[PDB]
Amino acid sequence: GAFLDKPKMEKHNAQGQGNGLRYGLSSMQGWRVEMEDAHTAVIGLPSGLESWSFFAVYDGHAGSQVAKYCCEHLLDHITNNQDFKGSAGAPSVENVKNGIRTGFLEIDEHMRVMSEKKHGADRSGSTAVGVLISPQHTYFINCGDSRGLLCRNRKVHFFTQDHKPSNPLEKERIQNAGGSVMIQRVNGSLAVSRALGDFDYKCVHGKGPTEQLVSPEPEVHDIERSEEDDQFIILACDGIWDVMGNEELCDFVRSRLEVTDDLEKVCNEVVDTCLYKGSRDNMSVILICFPNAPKVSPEAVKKEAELDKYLECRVEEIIKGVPDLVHVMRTLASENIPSLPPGGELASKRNVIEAVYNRLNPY
């Protein structure tokens, strides 16, 4: 219904280390009147999965109720059901894969009875994307238009495929549940074809839970882990992916990692870069790095210090009229400056340019 007059750019961070992993996250409200994103980051899991980890981004719609309940409870719905536990020993590929499906369906029904019982007024829904990381497998999980990727060996090794209504199997399901896809939207309103919650979209008679207008069924992919080649995993809501592609962001994160090992800082840079590339949505990013994540380079740090200083001089020189920040950005862009961060471009450097603009024209 509304945007803010000015963006809420305050970042919320977390970070941790364990099972050979390091992780950082950053969430920001941005231009939207509410923050309806949520996340989960836990290293070491209950009930004998000490050496497992779990990370997840939740993009909530029509309120944050569903997103928040998921962020605190999706994991135990996933690991504490007979499908995940099942077979006598350690959980197999199938156990894990079926366990997540059950987890997804059962928490959905759980939330439906809770809402029915307590007479809930919110009509919210949420995407989930994440990884369950075991000693030898990364299991990617997706439900909605949030997205995850694996950077392996300097390249995009795998990414999750967003559930858009106009996708062929999604459209088919929607049509069979008596709906249509109008442009990109389920009956002209809903932009996503899979989510937790959205219970009004889940009331077709004589169609299973996975056969409704909006499905809670996750897509799960088993990637075998690689001690030598596994570099980092990026999970983010569409607030990020709307304005940056797989290759770009993966190239950009690499560039940043070659400058800091501070993961919260890298995530802040993803989020600011995205706000400046024009994103007007809530943004949340998680960055999980593996032992062979890119390393800090003495040279890349110098190049960044050089580039920073260069951008400071241009600003000072561009001010002879006294142009506003917007106009300085325009001018700087039309200079076609070399060596800007890959993917990030000029946008990834606005905090540096702006801080300087302020040093010189503070009023």
The residues that touch Mn ion, with contacts defined as CB under 5 A, are 36, 59-60, 237-239, 281
CB-nearer residue toward Mn ion: 230 or 281: 281
Residue 185 to residue 165: CA distance in whole angstroms: 6
AA identity, residue 124: S
Under 8 Å CB-to-CB from 36, ≥6 apart: which residues? 59, 60, 61, 63, 64, 67, 124, 282
CB of 89 to Mn ion, least distance (A): 40
Residue type, position 38, single letter: A
Where do the H-state alpha helices sit in 198-262?
238-241, 246-257
CB atoms within 10 A of CB 294: 19
59 marked ligand binding residue: yes
Least separation, in Å, of the C-beta of 232 and Mn ion?
22
Which one-letter DSSP state was computed for residue 80?
S
Q: Which is nearer to Mn ion, 91 or 130 (CB)?
A: 130
CB nearer Mn ion, residue 60 or residue 218? 60
| Distance from C-alpha of 36 to C-alpha of 51, rounded to nearest angstrom | 31
Distance CA 31, CA 280 (A): 5
Min dist. Cβ of residue 197 to Mn ion (A): 12
3-state SS assignment for residue 16:
strand
The CB-of-60 to Mn ion minimum distance in angstroms stands at 5
162 is in an annotated binding site: no
Token digits of residue 357: 């603009």
Which of 84/199 has CB closer to Mn ion?
Answer: 199
CA distance 187 to 209: 19
Closer to Mn ion by Cβ: residue 1 or 89? 1
The reply, when asked if residue 60 is annotated as ligand binding, is yes
Closest distance to Mn ion from the beta carbon of 315 (Å): 33
Q: Is 122 annotated as a binding residue?
A: no
Q: Which is nearer to Mn ion, 239 or 294 (CB)?
A: 239
| Smallest distance, Mn ion to C-beta of residue 129, A | 12
Name the pairing type of β-strands 21-32 and 125-133: unpaired
The annotation places the binding site for Mn(2+) at 59-60, 238, 281
The annotation places the binding site at 59-60, 238, 281
